Specification:
Chain C: Belongs to the HIV-1 env protein family. The structure holds three protein chains of three kinds. By secondary structure, chain A is mainly β. Chain A has two helices and 18 strands. Helix content of chain B is about 0%, strand content about 50%. In chain B, the strands form four sheets. A six-stranded mixed β-sheet of chain B has the order 2-10-9-4-5-6, with no helix packed on it. The chains are: A mainly beta, B mainly beta, C mainly alpha.
Chain lengths: ~220, ~210, ~15
């Protein structure tokens, strides 16, 4: 019933000085009864308001450089950048251009580079935190590319879910990599019931998952 | 000259009402549709609804119908977005924009933070190391944002990564800062993370040893 | 009536 808007890819690596393309699809045709097709594109740089680039599939907004173009019909739509420049690193969104103005999910652009595997480290909770009643266990994934990475906590071989939170850095301006922290939070009482704490990391640069672990108290 | 200026950042508690504004200048405010867009911290854009300020014809997206009221006082070229009773999940950035025209203009955004947490400074815990090693500080359970971290009073910058804060289920924030260093420098080199949380006047220097 | 619709379907510009 309701139209659904999708984009591909969800993350797009680009290289300055080369072209780039993002796709948008709608679950049903976006052609209006008046014969026009109302599909817009928007750019949002980090910490800024969105700005429209394209409306009516292919009309460029004032002030938008001609390296940006829109294409497509019915259900298939593309935004192309003929030669990417530094200022083009941003999130891009397609949007149904009539009510209810459904946005696509966004495609995040980042700087392309060779695949780089993370270096993995695990940190037990400090004795000073434990005396307060909580245990935070931290797994660090350092300097990897691309962004996609999976972290699985294991406590005495039991897979943990719902009791961790992840944070990822912005892409590093130097080596174009990412870092990520995953923090497992347990009560002191629960932490003292188990021995082996492990973090298992899966990434495109690792031929086999990497596990780092410690034994409580050791 | 054409611009949309929004009201300032909001710090509120669950249960309060809230009405934020968007003033449009440099054009005939009554003749162009105004829309509101929500962006939850880290998520994408969502359309909330539009209004024609000339006659206050309002059309809500089905996802927000009944949750908010969009209105306008055209005598002062202002549109509004209003909540009867805020929830913590209304924490987001809210944008106004001109909708449906050949020209595109957006407000600067209004950051709305809704929380029943009280101001609280962080506890700082070591992430201790045991040919490259890693160490760090865990900065836990603080409110509100932000906290700043440096290493060795700013003299150590190579290899430092300070992560974005996360919001814990408790309503308090946490973050970590790490540095990678030659394992041969452990013991001979000193590593101190300097943490500052201005809202609570908290300043901490934590020496991290193996 | 028509101006309202005109303003909604990407036909009307703004000039500072």
């Amino acid at each position: 019933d309701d139209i659904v808007m999708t984009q591909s890819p969800l993350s797009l690596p680009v290289t300055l000085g080369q072209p780039a393309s993002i796709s948008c699809r709608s679950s049903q045709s976006l052609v209006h009864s008046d014969g026009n097709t109302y599909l817009n594109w928007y750019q949002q740089r980090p910490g800024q308001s969105p700005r429209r680039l394209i409306y009516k599939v292919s009309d460029r907004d004032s002030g938008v450089p001609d390296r940006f173009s829109g294409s497509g019909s019915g259900t298939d739509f593309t935004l192309e950048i003929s030669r990417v420049e530094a200022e083009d690193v941003a999130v891009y969104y397609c949007m149904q251009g009539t009510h209810p103005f459904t946005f696509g999910p966004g495609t995040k652009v980042d700087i392309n580079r060779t695949v780089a595997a993370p270096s993995v480290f695990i940190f037990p909770p400090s004795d000073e935190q434990l005396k307060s009643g909580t245990a935070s266990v931290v797994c660090l994934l350092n300097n990897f590319y691309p962004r996609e990475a999976k972290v699985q906590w294991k406590v005495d071989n039991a897979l943990q879910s719902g009791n961790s939170q992840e944070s990822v850095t912005e892409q590093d301006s130097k080596d174009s990599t990412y870092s990520l922290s995953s923090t497992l939070t347990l009560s002191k009482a629960d932490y003292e019931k188990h021995k082996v704490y492990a973090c298992e990391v899966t990434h495109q640069g690792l031929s086999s998952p990497v596990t780092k672990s410690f034994n409580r108290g050791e | 000259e054409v611009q949309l200026v929004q009201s300032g950042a909001e710090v509120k508690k669950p249960g309060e009402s809230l009405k934020i504004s968007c003033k449009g200048s440099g054009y005939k405010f009554s003749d162009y549709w105004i829309g509101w867009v929500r962006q939850m911290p880290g998520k994408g854009l969502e359309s909330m609804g539009i209004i024609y300020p000339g006659d206050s014809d309002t059309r809500y997206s089905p996802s927000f119908q009944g949750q908010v009221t969009i209105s306008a006082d055209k005598s002062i070229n202002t549109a509004y977005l209003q909540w009867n009773t805020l929830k913590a999940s209304d924490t987001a950035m809210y944008y106004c924009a001109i909708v449906g025209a050949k020209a595109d203009y957006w407000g600067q955004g209004t950051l709305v933070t809704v929380s029943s947490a009280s101001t609280k400074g962080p506890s700082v815990f070591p992430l201790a190391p045991s040919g490259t090693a890693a160490l760090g500080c865990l900065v836990k359970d603080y409110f509100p944002e932000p906290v700043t971290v440096s290493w060795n009073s700013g003299a150590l910058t190579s290899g430092v990564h300070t992560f974005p804060a996360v919001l814990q289920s408790s309503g308090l924030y946490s973050l970590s800062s790490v540095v990678t260093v030659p394992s041969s420098s452990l013991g001979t080199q000193t590593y101190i993370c300097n943490v500052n949380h201005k809202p609570s006047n908290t300043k901490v220097d934590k020496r991290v040893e193996p | 009536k028509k101006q309202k619709v005109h303003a909604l379907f990407y036909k009307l510009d703004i000039v500072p």
